[PDB]
Amino acid sequence: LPFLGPAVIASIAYMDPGNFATNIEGGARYGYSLLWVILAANLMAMVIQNLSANLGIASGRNLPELIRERWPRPLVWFYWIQAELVAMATDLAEFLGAALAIQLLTGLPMFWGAVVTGVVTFWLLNLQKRGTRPLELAVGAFVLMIGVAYLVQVVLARPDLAAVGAGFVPRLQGPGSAYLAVGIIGATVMPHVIYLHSADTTEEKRRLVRLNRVDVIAAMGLAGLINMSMLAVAAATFHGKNVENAGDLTTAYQTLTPLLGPAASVLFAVALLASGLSSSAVGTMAGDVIMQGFMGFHIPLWLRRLITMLPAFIVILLGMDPSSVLILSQVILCFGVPFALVPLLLFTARRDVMGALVTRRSFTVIGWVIAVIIIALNGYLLWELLGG
Ligand SMILES: CCCCCCCC/C=C\CCCCCCCC(=O)OC[C@H](O)CO
Ligand SMILES: CCCCCCCC/C=C\CCCCCCCC(=O)OC[C@H](O)CO
Ligand SMILES: CCCCCCCC/C=C\CCCCCCCC(=O)OC[C@H](O)CO
Ligand SMILES: [Cl-]
Ligand SMILES: [Cl-]
Numbered sequence: 001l002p003f004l005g006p007a008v009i010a011s012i013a014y015m016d017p018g019n020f021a022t023n024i025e026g027g028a029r030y031g032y033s034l035l036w037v038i039l040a041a042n043l044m045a046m047v048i049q050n051l052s053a054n055l056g057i058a059s060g061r062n063l064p065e066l067i068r069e070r071w072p073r074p075l076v077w078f079y080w081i082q083a084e085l086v087a088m089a090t091d092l093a094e095f096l097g098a099a100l101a102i103q104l105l106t107g108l109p110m111f112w113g114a115v116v117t118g119v120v121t122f123w124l125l126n127l128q129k130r131g132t133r134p135l136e137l138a139v140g141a142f143v144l145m146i147g148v149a150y151l152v153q154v155v156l157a158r159p160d161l162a163a164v165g166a167g168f169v170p171r172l173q174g175p176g177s178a179y180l181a182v183g184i185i186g187a188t189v190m191p192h193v194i195y196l197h198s199a200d201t202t203e204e205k206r207r208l209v210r211l212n213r214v215d216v217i218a219a220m221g222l223a224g225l226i227n228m229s230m231l232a233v234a235a236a237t238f239h240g241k242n243v244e245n246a247g248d249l250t251t252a253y254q255t256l257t258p259l260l261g262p263a264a265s266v267l268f269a270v271a272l273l274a275s276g277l278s279s280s281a282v283g284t285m286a287g288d289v290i291m292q293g294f295m296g297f298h299i300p301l302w303l304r305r306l307i308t309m310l311p312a313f314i315v316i317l318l319g320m321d322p323s324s325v326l327i328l329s330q331v332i333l334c335f336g337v338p339f340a341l342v343p344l345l346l347f348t349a350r351r352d353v354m355g356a357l358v359t360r361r362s363f364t365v366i367g368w369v370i371a372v373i374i375i376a377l378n379g380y381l382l383w384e385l386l387g388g
Contacts, residue, residue, distance in 0.1 A: 010219035011226070012143040017097025017276045018187040018333075021249060021326035023227055026180050027234030028247030032159070032167030035228055037181045039168065041188035042224035044370045046217055048189055048341065049197060051348050051359065051367060053212045056198030057205050058357035059347070063195050063340075064293030066347055079339070080294035083195050086336040087287040090192040091280055091308040093329040095121070096315065098276030100249060100322040104269035110316045117280070118309055124281045125305060139274035146256075146271035147222075150229040153259045157236040164232065175384040182381050183327045185374065186334030188227070194340040196286040199293075202356045209357065230255070249323040284308055335378050341371045 026034045056062060061069075064083065068076050098120075099113035108116070124135075172178050237255045238246040245251045253268040260267055284305050292298040315325050345367045348359045359367075 004218075006215040007218035007222050008144060009140060010215065011147070011222040012140045013279075013282075014188075014190070014219065014223040015143045015147065015226070015275050016093060016187060016190075016279055017100075017272060018093040018183075018326050018330040019227055020097070020230070020252065020272060020275070021093070021323055022180060022183045022187050022330055023230040024234045024249065024252045024255070025247035025323065025327060026184060027231040027236075028238035028243075030173065030177055030180065031235045031239040032163045032232060033171055033173060034177070034181060034184065035164065035167035035231065036170045037184045038188070038224060038227050038231060040170070041185040042220055042227070044185070044374075045189045046220050047363065047366060047370060048194065048337075048344070049216050049220070050213055051344050051363075052194050052197040053216065054209050054357060054359070055344065055348050055354070057208045057212070058354040059198075060200070062198035062289070062293055063343055063347070064290050066353065067343055068294055068296065071343075076294055079343070080291065082336060082339050083290050083294065084287070086191050086195070086333060086340075087283065087290065088308060088311060089329040089332045089336075090190070091283045091287070092311050092315075093326045094276045094279035094283060095309065095312045096276075096322050097249075097326060098273050098280060099312065099316070101269045101273035101276060104250065104253075105266065105273065110322065111313070114309070114312050114316055117277070120277060121280055121284070122302070122305065124277070125284070125301065136278055139278045142267075142271045142274040146267065147226040147229075149256050149259060149267075150226055150233055153233045153256060154229040154236075156259060157233055159232050159236045163235075175381075178377065178381045178384065179331060180327065182334045182377055183330040185377070186330040186332070186337070188224075189334070189337050191333055191336045191340045192283060192286060194337075194344060195290050195293075199289055205355075205357055247323075248321075249326070331381075334374065338371050338375050338378070341367065341374075345371065 023038075026037075052063070055066075059066065064080075067079055071079075095114070095117060098117045099110055102108060102113035102116050103110055106113075124132075172181065233255045234247065234252070237243075243251070243254075249272070253265040256264040256268060285301075287304055287308070288298055288301055291304075315322075345364060347353045349364050351358055
């Protein structure tokens with residue numbers, strides 16, 4: 001593949017419907033003041049995903065399998081349940097985003113939107129490796145081109161450069177800002193990948209480590225520029241204008257209207273649907289690998305797909321706002337990150353696991369600082385959600 005090739009394919013996988021929810025709402029409600037969050041969360045994701053990838057290369061096993069073989073039964077069971085909750089919140093945002101996109105495209109109610117998504121995800125579940133390549137290449141194009149749109153639009157929108165520069169200085173402005181900051185971190189780090197991304201020769205093992213290190217930083221850098229662009233465009237579009245339903249995904253197409261014209265609405269919803277269909281399908285398979293890795297057995301794949309749809313339909317029948325619950329799921333995912341980092345930081349520092357590929361002492365320290373920072377942000381948010 002060409003030089004930039006790997007950076008493009010891995011970046012579209014990072015574009016969750018939860019990124020749309022957090023970037024649009026972040027810019028429309030708090031201007032440019034959360035740009036440092038997207039930047040910080042992206043750098044932390046570069047460290048974390050590198051440790052996750054180097055653990056699979058050095059040890060030949062994934063994190064659930066290493067926990068199952070090395071830790072006591074009650075701790076394996078605890079981390080299995082915690083990993084299953086991460087899979088629930090991860091698939092909830094993706095499945096609900098696709099159903100919402102169906103509603104934006106056709107006008108059907110959210111219930112039937114989730115039913116359409118359910119048939120598609122059930123049918124996509126049956127298809128083997130043959131057939132996924134034409135569909136995953138098409139959804140990659142929609143999501144990639146909507147990302148290039150925001151990269152171009154961030155220049156044509158003429159954003160307030162003084163406010164853009166100030167937005168890179170870390171500032172939390174109220175309790176609602178921390179809630180959205182936590183959601184941005186949860187949407188960037190993606191703890192479900194931590195448990196799955198891990199899934200011979202020392203000189204050959206170092207080649208894959210150096211090769212993976214370059215590809216993930218090019219992809220995270222591209223995904224980080226697009227996320228900041230989507231937030232900055234949302235800030236320039238809505239912030240300080242008292243627009244009806246500002247930051248909401250039902251009116252988010254207005255961010256690309258001066259560029260795409262009358263096509264902005266369909267092109268946004270199509271990209272939202274493609275971002276949710278591919279993500280909901282790969283995540284429910286990743287949930288199957290995680291249980292088999294933790295427990296040594298797995299439930300039928302159709303049953304897991306059904307259980308993951310139950311929170312989606314319940315949220316719909318409750319009448320809850322889809323854009324609001326997409327942000328909540330990313331907030332919950334951010335609470336699962338510190339639990340995922342503890343086995344990651346410990347295993348990658350052991351020679352009997354990594355061999356000659358033991359992590360540098362400095363990057364282990366940086367990883368623990370990242371874990372302490374996220375615990376601090378989660379506890380700070382949890383304190384203000386219980387009064388105090
Ligand atoms: C709490 C939620 C739990 C819901 C409980 C199930 C609800 C029934 C739905 C579909 C059953 C029919 C679809 C599956 C039947 C064919 C699938 C199959 O392959 O056989 C099933 C069996 O597990 C060997 O694999
Ligand atoms: C304000 C920001 C606060 C965020 C906190 C700082 C996060 C960024 C720090 C370093 C990034 C460098 C990571 C680039 C890739 C490094 C490779 C790696 O992660 O691990 C390899 C290991 O060292 C093999 O032995
Ligand atoms: C507690 C709240 C405020 C604290 C804020 C600072 C966080 C604590 C400092 C470092 C964390 C532990 C990192 C240092 C231990 C790393 C383990 C290590 O590097 O050991 C060598 C490794 O085994 C090579 O093989
Ligand atoms: Cl261990
Ligand atoms: Cl401003």
